[PDB]
Amino acid sequence: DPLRPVVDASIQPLLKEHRIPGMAVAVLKDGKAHYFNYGVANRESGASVSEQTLFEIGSVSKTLTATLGAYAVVKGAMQLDDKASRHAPWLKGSVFDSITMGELATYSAGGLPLQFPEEVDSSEKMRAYYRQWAPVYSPGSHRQYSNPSIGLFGHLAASSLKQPFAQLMEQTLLPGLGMHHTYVNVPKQAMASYAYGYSKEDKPIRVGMLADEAYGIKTSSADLLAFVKANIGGVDDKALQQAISLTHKGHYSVGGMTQGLGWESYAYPVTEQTLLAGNSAKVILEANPTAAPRQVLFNKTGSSNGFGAYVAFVPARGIGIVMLANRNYPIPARVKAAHAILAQLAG
Ligand SMILES: *C(=O)[C@@H](NC(=O)/C(=N\OC(C)(C)C(=O)O)c1csc(N)n1)[C@H](C)NS(=O)(=O)O
Ligand SMILES: [Zn+2]
Ligand SMILES: [Zn+2]
Ligand SMILES: [Zn+2]
């Protein structure tokens, strides 16, 4: 593979510097998938990573949850300007009478936090959490990246479709996308392909309320590259195609980043500096005011304990990259390596 030297030059230094036990890398160019696999999925078994190895992709899950939401819209079960409580009777009477589904999807409802408080560990406590929640900002005015925000959006999207979220994903959406080894619940027969994550102390670890919706997907580099392909070349089902397209529309911007449903987008070519800034601690951790929206590059980061994932692609150039590791290594390292590889593929 004549792309191997290019990918190795950017990936190998990451593996050494951060002692990454294993990484699956997949690249798309000119309609062809290329797989580059490094190290081990499981340090006990010493089993090699392949493009069929399942990794936790953490917040990259939000691109798939967004696509379910968009599918619900395409099917007429909901609209992004619906008030949230329209799809949750238990939210009637709360501030969610005046927050929209799109605002939940784009983390712009008014300062829902990054994580549920640790005490919110059941269905009953979660419902009380949202019912008592007091907005910090007016709806639409600030982005605060939030699991409770998009988690709720996904949860209500499934409810709009009258099916549990895990079932819709595993039985309809993901196989519709060509993703047959992508799970919220990894089945018995897939367990032997399931990587372990490795904490900073080299302890093996595996994955909360609305975990499924916000960060719970297990998938392979092959499946994730198929999702990238679907975001470039498209898919057979008309409803799913339109769903995917809705996830590309920009809602608002924060600096040079434009927020859509799940995917975050940039004018391409994109400087390393612009891509680093939109994926910076400032953008991830603080509230930022929303501004008017923007070739286009789409990306999403994901970081669970013991896992670090990144996906980026450019439909106008037919290029894309997936990087899945079982170490949570820094986002800037992911962004830099991806940017370098895509620049070489773009020619
Ligand atoms: C998405 O991956 C999201 N990550 C999380 O919600 C989790 N942890 O976040 C950090 C490490 C900040 C924390 O400890 O609070 C998480 C999910 S399952 C699990 N065990 N941890 C992050 C914030 N998104 S990303 O874009 O920064 O990667
Ligand atoms: Zn490190
Ligand atoms: Zn209840
Ligand atoms: Zn529910």
Ligand SMILES: [Zn+2]
């Ligand atoms: Zn520690």
Ligand SMILES: [Zn+2]
């Ligand atoms: Zn057809």
Ligand SMILES: [Zn+2]
């Ligand atoms: Zn919007």
Ligand SMILES: [Zn+2]
């Ligand atoms: Zn402000």
